[PDB]
Amino acid sequence: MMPTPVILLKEGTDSSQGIPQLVSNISACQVIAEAVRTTLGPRGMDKLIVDGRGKATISNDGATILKLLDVVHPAAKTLVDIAKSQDAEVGDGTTSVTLLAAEFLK
Amino acid sequence: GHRPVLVLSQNTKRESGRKVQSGNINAAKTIADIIRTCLGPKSMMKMLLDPMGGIVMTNDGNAILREIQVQHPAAKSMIEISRTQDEEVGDGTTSVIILAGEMLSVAEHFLEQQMHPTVVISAYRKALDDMISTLKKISIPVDISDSDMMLNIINSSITTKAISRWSSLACNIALDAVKMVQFEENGRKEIDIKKYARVEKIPGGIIEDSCVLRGVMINKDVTHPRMRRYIKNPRIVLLDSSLEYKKGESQTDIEITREEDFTRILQMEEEYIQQLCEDIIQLKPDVVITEKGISDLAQHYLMRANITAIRRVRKTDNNRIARACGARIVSRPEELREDDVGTGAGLLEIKKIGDEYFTFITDCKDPKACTILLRGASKEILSEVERNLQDAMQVCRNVLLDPQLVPGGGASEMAVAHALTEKSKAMTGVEQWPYRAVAQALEVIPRTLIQNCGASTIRLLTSLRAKHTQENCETWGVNGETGTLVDMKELGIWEPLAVKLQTYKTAVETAVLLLRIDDIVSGHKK
Amino acid sequence: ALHVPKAPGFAQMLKEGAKHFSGLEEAVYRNIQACKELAQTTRTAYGPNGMNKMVINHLEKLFVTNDAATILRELEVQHPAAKMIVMASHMQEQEVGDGTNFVLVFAGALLELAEELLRIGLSVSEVIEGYEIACRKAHEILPNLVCCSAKNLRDIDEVSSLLRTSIMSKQYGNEVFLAKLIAQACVSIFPDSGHFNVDNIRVCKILGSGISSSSVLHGMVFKKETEGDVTSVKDAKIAVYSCPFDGMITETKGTVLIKTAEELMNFSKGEENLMDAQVKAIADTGANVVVTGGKVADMALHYANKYNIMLVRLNSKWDLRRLCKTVGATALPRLTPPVLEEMGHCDSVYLSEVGDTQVVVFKHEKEDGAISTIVLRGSTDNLMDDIERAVDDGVNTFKVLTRDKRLVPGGGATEIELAKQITSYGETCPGLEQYAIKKFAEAFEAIPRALAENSGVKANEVISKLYAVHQEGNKNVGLDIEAEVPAVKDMLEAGILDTYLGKYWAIKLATNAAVTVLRVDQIIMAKPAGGPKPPSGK
Amino acid sequence: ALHVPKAPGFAQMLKEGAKHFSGLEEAVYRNIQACKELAQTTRTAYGPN
Amino acid sequence: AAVKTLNPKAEVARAQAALAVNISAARGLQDVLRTNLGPKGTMKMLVSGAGDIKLTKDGNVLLHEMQIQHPTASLIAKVATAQDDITGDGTTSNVLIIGELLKQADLYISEGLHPRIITEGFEAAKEKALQFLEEVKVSREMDRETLIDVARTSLRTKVHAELADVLTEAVVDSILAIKKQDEPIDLFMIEIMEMKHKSETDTSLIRGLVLDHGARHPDMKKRVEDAYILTCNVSLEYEKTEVNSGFFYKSAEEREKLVKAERKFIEDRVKKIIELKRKVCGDSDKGFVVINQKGIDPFSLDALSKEGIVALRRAKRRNMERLTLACGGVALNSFDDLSPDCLGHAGLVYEYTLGEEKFTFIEKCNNPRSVTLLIKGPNKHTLTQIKDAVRDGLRAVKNAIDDGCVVPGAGAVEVAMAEALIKHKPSVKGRAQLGVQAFADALLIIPKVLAQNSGFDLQETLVKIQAEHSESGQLVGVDLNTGEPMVAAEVGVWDNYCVKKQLLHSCTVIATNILLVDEIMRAGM
Amino acid sequence: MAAVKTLNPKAEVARAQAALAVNISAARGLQDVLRTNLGPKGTMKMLVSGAGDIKLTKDGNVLLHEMQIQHPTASLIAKVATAQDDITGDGTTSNVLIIGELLKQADLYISEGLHPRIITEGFEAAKEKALQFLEEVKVSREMDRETLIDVARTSLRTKVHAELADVLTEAVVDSILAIKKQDEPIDLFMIEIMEMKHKSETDTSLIRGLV
């Protein structure tokens, strides 16, 4: 790396490229799936999420849990989006879509 | 607690004694030294940086002095006297400052010699009276009907400026403008160049193209393109009221309950505009100039009668046009008369200069107002040319008011100094020493001229004084260029008596005022 | 003996934050380096095997795509030379709609070869002259490389096959289905008159069912719900109004002046009767669907429900105009009943739910109409945005085909043929400009080289094979992405084709941008100001 | 046009805290004034009185 | 310092310091602007604080876009601004000549010579040079070829050679179109419109007008072949009463009646327009186009479109005059008495759409006294550069037409004036001969800079040109390709006489004024 | 911008014409300072140190060392003048003046695009010719007392005023003639210079002994 008196992109721009970027994306997807793993099946467990104001949400639906999770990882937000898509089109299976996608990537 | 107790408030400083007088005299000396080198035909120019971002490349003493900020109040008094001299007579600003500085310098010697300032002040006032008497004695009359003599006077007034290169043109412009502005109504002579001798600076072109117009030029254009831009012998009507439909002063509300009232109101607005325009047209004018807006419908109605109209004009420009073309500004067109119609303008042309439209009402016969069109290198050069033209016009009006002249180039200073020295020999009291001191202090003008010319000061001053000790040598000065003694009867340098009298009075009274001061107190708020 | 002072003159007179770059090394080489860096940044997305890029702009809006113009738009480019190249790419996008990555790659390669030419001793003016001559030669050669013509724009199959190549670069996995959809949508539009409008194709993105469930609708779809009781009409006679569905009022000032008890007791009843009369008069024309651009009054809604009138409210005036074009009605400024010529007709209007979104559908049945809508399904908003970009590229390709019906071989065959011909021309040109002409010819290698690098094969072997096949005579042979080893095949038979206008404009714009960058010798950058954008951009 | 730069040459090469007075007004008159002030301070103690 | 003694926080530069500061500023400006001179000059790229990109070669534009806070630089910028405002050319030569005059004066001033003698010599040399310029000018009848040559000598220096060749034809044709016999040329009658879709060589001349706005009603025709033009300045939208009236009613029917009646005023004028359109043309072949300086409400737009009338609203103020001169109608501020005589004629009106923007073309006029140049290019900075180039070309052609005299370029006149001044130098008394020599050497800067930018060396090229001129007596300039002396008059390298006169006058005046300045003060705080 | 600045961001670099401008400006500033020292009529400078020490001087070397300057080219010129003073003992102001005028005249031609190498070649040729002419023009004379007195005058009259120089001429000439041995180098260490602060400046004299 060289100073390049006049820089090309805006100062502070962060970039990631190559295989490590994709591996990090897969790891983020696994982390997202781990948050709703246990809410699947008759023996599933509820999750409690507290917002900034202090209101607590107790839920078992995967889409609700993912929405309450303020995920900012660009690759991880895909799982939240597909959970929302499954909730919108069908209404059930919001945990299954995330588990299947994360398992495919793994 | 228990904040300190004391008589006067905090930050209330006080100084008194010989220190105050020394500080005042030093401040006056330093103010004089600031512009000491800007005197004479060989004076250098200065560059003043306006805090707003502008640049003032000037040689005028008052212009330099008023562009600086000072903290010492004596310097403030010096700036004030410079402004007073500039306003009263027009020129001499950088000479009165030098004279006052020299007078205070020669007074400090006596203040350090256990002499009370009141005696010095009395001697200074006696000296001023005798200076005025001597200046009135050695004056010469001038007939104002001779154009050549007036031109020579203006030239001698402008040899020390940056316009001396084009001195003939500058003198002709100034003399023509001053003569044209001259007016007399109800038995009251009036020469108002401040309001009726307007200087318009348009950058570009060459300075040789600058001239004085027999009319008024403004930065205006016709409201509508179809309107005439060239009229041979226009009849001019001036208005200072809008040709639009405006609300009345009293609060007014309409109540519409019928179908046709809205359109009726709009139609009556149009009809009122038409009636106003018909009242204008009844006098059959050629152009109409208004200080306020003209509605588009009014424009159409005026154009139907083939009338040119200028929409918005400042009050001063409208007054200048009224003076130039002999019109009379009216407000209600229903009361417009034939007398108010402006006939006398010989041409109205709206031409394009650079990328701007300018309206010319030139070619007037017997106009009482004029515009001096100045064209030059840039804004600063034009500003300096305007300052020099202002000095020339002020000198011309001073000569017209008072036709008395006195020799220039330090000849008057040396003559008055010699007269005061001769008169002081009869004095026997202690007052004689400050009297003689201010007498020889008056010699600072030829010394400054010699110093700026680059010649040797001491031998030239000695020879000039020896020459002035002779009998008929009241008109012997120094060349500002060659640095040699010369009779001013043959060089031609003459300055108005009013200017010299004002300069001497201002210098002496400034010296008196600054000598009357002790025990400076500062810090108190308004 | 401790500090080096600034040289007297311009260096001392410069402002505190300004920068002055002058000369070859200080300005031109730096500009070339920045442009090459930008080109290499966008390089990896070129071709069908291009890789999508996740870009987060300053507002944390996520873009994932392989479209060069979109990536450059979402990138905060700061080097002004790269800004000029990006502007050239954007101009190419606006003029044609595809080839932005080609423009960027060609400009970068041209500037790199210009840098090496300057290093070997050639002056900037000679390089510029050689580049201009070579660009003129390339534009002269290009028409001779046309292999086939569109020769029909009203056939679904042929238009789909033509548009297949344009939307193979984006969404390489499934391009046949998208090609069929866009072909049907564009064939519904483009009537007997040769004029074709891009904006007549509308894209609706409804999330939930995967992009394989998308379809083309000969009509318009609005993501909202009806405001009345009626939710389905089978013989729509839509009457479109631009005024709010209410009794119009005076524009000056309304004031109900009441002076007697009778007026007070009768005002509301009279207003009701007037509204009822207006609504009944509108309904008596046969109209059964009413569309308004303004607010809907409660009394007007009640009387519309009384007379079985379907209400749709379109806040956007653009949507109102598009609906007027779709149906054939005129937006009446007042609430008067519509005469028979200005009352639009639609074959079916109904309220429906797709996924979890309620929509209102103005559906025709004939394969015609002014406006056709493509409803896009999917599982992610980003995926649907990418599919929308692909549809936009396909529509622009169809528009270009309407403008000019000439095609050139794809897969790098055209670039190799152009490089060979320009090199042959430059080998016969005496003077110093032969080096510049040869470098301009060599710059065309960056396209097949990028294709080979993205496809995962060795670029040098591919380029050598391409030169061999083009030298022996075959001009339609290009890179074969469907192989694990460097291999080539005929592109005309394989159906990979590119529009002639796209290549022409891309070459012209890339050459112009490179020459403009080369012409710059001194740079004076003012002190940057962190202002919140100029007011012009709003 | 709001700041007067230091003249090229010795004016710019002068050190940060140094001062340079040259010419008649800047040097000779100032030295004479300082000597006058010193003599003024000592003057009042001259003689038996 | 006295000023520092009064105001401690004041900056002063006295005498030699003032002269050194001024000369340094002038020299820095000169070294920056040397590379602008000549068609072989180098483009300068200018980035503003907001990041806007500006490629330009003009001296005035460069001076305005340099980040300089120097007083002498400000004065020179003002001088160049006046030069550009009046003549539109010579700003780079202005700065170069000012800087070289100051340097040549300093050469003798550093030897103890007083600047006043130098200024007097400058005055005498300026007078002699003006006399020589009067002697050397070529009085020619300005046909199309000479104007094309002048436009080439400007544009080639200001823009790429091929774009310069296109702009020459465009500018000369426009000027010849708008120019009447022995009447001052109004450059406001040429509209410079910028479109950003095609290439830079597509810039052309339209014998009519191009408007940056189109019809606001979708049903209006996009292209009318034979059209009557109605240029008006009458409001066609609802307008409030000036007296704050408001309405009062007691029933819904009364409110409806008032709503219908409140539009009658505008409807009457719309009806007048429609009646005139019906009277002038009863068939569909002819068309009606309404261009209004005031807005038009949607109701009037609908009423007009129902009658097949194209209406453009909110036109530019100068567009009234431009349409009146080109189409040939009469601009109307009211419809009280409208007649078919006031209608202009246009042989083709059509609307062109470019992105979000929308444009209207009015061509095929009978004898358009006002035309428009369509600046076309792919980049914003390209459009700005072409706009500056066409402004310079229009100014040059107008100056050439104004006075039938044109001066040979390529620095030939500079060399001839330098030799004439050298010959006249013995006639000057005193030490002003040094000032005259300095003025001649300063005038010699233009061939020096031209040769330097062309790649050759200053000394050899200058001595070759001077020897050729001395032995032959012709006006020989600099051949920017070979470097040999060449007769600029025979090859077509022409320069404006007024530009040269203004250059001499302004440069001499500003150099004399700067030389005599012995103090810069900043004590206004 | 520059390569060095790219490698070292906080570096100061002056390249191409900038270096020439900087060096010539420094030389011209030094020359302008030292113009008023040449000749017996040159003005006398007073230098005040940090501690407040007063030093009246007119020498080029003394002025250069006690003048507040922090410039590289000034440092090189100061080193050259220091060597000149160390070896020959005189001709320090002339050194700076000649260097500055050489650089100014060279700039006068370099500003017309002339490469400095040509100017340096001309300088070397002119130096050779001038050295030959100096060898031709020198006056070989047996150094009696009168000639030594004249040389001492030509130095001290520039260094000090008239009568003081007249006294110092006799002092230095007599001292040198006293310590000088025929056909031997003069050892200046044998003239001890002592300072006393009790009489007038004209009371300085030579003692045929030691103090």
Ligand SMILES: Nc1ncnc2c1ncn2[C@@H]1O[C@H](COP(=O)(O)OP(=O)(O)O)[C@@H](O)[C@H]1O
């Ligand atoms: N050619 C000249 N020769 C000698 N003295 C002159 C000449 N011209 C003007 N003067 C003198 O110089 C003075 C004018 O100087 P100026 O710069 O106008 O100062 P001020 O503005 O105070 O009058 C006058 O008093 C006049 O006597």
Ligand SMILES: Nc1ncnc2c1ncn2[C@@H]1O[C@H](COP(=O)(O)OP(=O)(O)O)[C@@H](O)[C@H]1O
């Ligand atoms: N099936 C294919 N095999 C090989 N090359 C292809 C194929 N389809 C398209 N291409 C090539 O990909 C290029 C398109 O790149 P693309 O990503 O669209 O960049 P741009 O959007 O700037 O045109 C074309 O030049 C074409 O030659």
Ligand SMILES: Nc1ncnc2c1ncn2[C@@H]1O[C@H](COP(=O)(O)OP(=O)(O)O)[C@@H](O)[C@H]1O
């Ligand atoms: N083709 C040419 N050959 C030789 N000299 C030329 C040619 N074109 C222009 N010149 C000379 O170069 C100069 C161009 O200067 P220019 O860049 O126009 O400066 P400015 O814009 O300030 O006038 C003109 O004075 C002209 O004499």
Ligand SMILES: [Mg+2]
């Ligand atoms: Mg479930």
Ligand SMILES: [Mg+2]
């Ligand atoms: Mg005066």
Ligand SMILES: [Mg+2]
């Ligand atoms: Mg593409």
Ligand SMILES: [Mg+2]
């Ligand atoms: Mg030019």
Ligand SMILES: [Mg+2]
């Ligand atoms: Mg010596």
